[PDB]
Amino acid sequence: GNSNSVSRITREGKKITYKLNIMQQPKRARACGQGSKSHTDRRPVDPPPVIELNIFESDPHDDSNKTDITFVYNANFFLFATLEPERPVLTGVPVAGVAYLDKPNRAGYFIFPDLSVRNEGSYRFSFHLFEQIKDPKDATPQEFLEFRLEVISNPFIVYSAKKFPGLTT
Amino acid sequence: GNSNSVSRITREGKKITYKLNIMQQPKRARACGQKSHTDRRPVDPPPVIELNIFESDPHDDSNKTDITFVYNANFFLFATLEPERPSPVLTGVPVAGVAYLDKPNRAGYFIFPDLSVRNEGSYRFSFHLFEQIKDPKDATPQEFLEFRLEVISNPFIVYSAKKFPGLTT
Numbered sequence A: 001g002n003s004n005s006v007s008r009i010t011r012e013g014k015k016i017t018y019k020l021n022i023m024q025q026p027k028r029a030r031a032c033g034q035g036s037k038s039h040t041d042r043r044p045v046d047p048p049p050v051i052e053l054n055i056f057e058s059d060p061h062d063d064s065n066k067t068d069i070t071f072v073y074n075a076n077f078f079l080f081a082t083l084e085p086e087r088p089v090l091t092g093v094p095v096a097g098v099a100y101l102d103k104p105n106r107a108g109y110f111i112f113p114d115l116s117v118r119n120e121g122s123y124r125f126s127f128h129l130f131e132q133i134k135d136p137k138d139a140t141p142q143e144f145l146e147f148r149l150e151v152i153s154n155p156f157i158v159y160s161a162k163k164f165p166g167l168t169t
Numbered sequence B: 001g002n003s004n005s006v007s008r009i010t011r012e013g014k015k016i017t018y019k020l021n022i023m024q025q026p027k028r029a030r031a032c033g034q035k036s037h038t039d040r041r042p043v044d045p046p047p048v049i050e051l052n053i054f055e056s057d058p059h060d061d062s063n064k065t066d067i068t069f070v071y072n073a074n075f076f077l078f079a080t081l082e083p084e085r086p087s088p089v090l091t092g093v094p095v096a097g098v099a100y101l102d103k104p105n106r107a108g109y110f111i112f113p114d115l116s117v118r119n120e121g122s123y124r125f126s127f128h129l130f131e132q133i134k135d136p137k138d139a140t141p142q143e144f145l146e147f148r149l150e151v152i153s154n155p156f157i158v159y160s161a162k163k164f165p166g167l168t169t
Helices: none
Strands: A003-009 A015-024 A028-030 A050-058 A066-068 A075-085 A090-092 A095-097 A099-101 A107-111 A115-117 A121-133 A146-152 A156-159 B003-009 B015-024 B028-030 B048-056 B073-083 B090-092 B095-097 B099-101 B107-111 B115-117 B121-133 B145-152 B156-159
Touching (some): A015 A121, A015 A146, A028 A115, A050 A075, A075 A090, A075 B145, A095 B145, A121 B073, B015 B121, B015 B145, B028 B115, B048 B073, B095 B107
Antiparallel strands (some): A050 A107, A075 A095, A090 A115, A099 A107, B003 B015, B015 B048, B048 B107, B073 B095, B073 B121, B090 B115, B099 B107, B121 B145
């Protein structure tokens, strides 16, 4: 349940598949609360969520064969994080740009190192992929933003540290 | 209840306030499933959100000045579906570009005419604003997307139409 994929067809008849895979799930976070200290003395979600993106060309004849064109496909990609209660709350920078790396896999990567949750509880992360196309053949303000697909994280727990006035000081 | 505001400070020391307010709440939709009335599926009436941007000088932080037509940046509004009682559930085009209009008010406007819900139930819409900055001094993969704020809609009902063979085809 770490991955999700979507497919679309371009004007040139090309079948493009987007695959999102969460490689580093969140596990825990300390509720940062509100106030002036909440924006400068917080502990972000750890380990930072990391999402891998792959793009596949499918030749029209044989669909058992795909070609990873992640390093060839020319478009802007952004990944946006939302906080879904399992039963603003999310602070920080919820938008990550793509970084193309060869290890551990040849793909694009999104990292979220500065996510904070305001209140304790159980949450899931939803990561939404936006594509900004620069070649008109790839099509399905003079720039457009297209939602592509979404991946759902495993549940993680935000705890609250108990208060001990004379102890923590 | 239909609006939300968020303030930031640019590099010049000016305070910039973004205000999102919903002009047309969603009311009803017919579950689209995976029933020959297909224009009955898009959420109706199409949700409409207006955006206003206000400038406050560091010398006077108590007064605001609308700069919605002056602020040089691209804007996008992204719709997410929130279950009021917590293959995609939301379908269509969930990204709306901004349109600058003078009537009914001089502001930016987003319209969502092509949103569909797969399952019946009570839902809410969350609209997230993304700012694509073109002027570097307005600042707080060469292009970047910045999240600003979200506005949450009133609950709306998605209903299902029963099948009566020999009566409803």
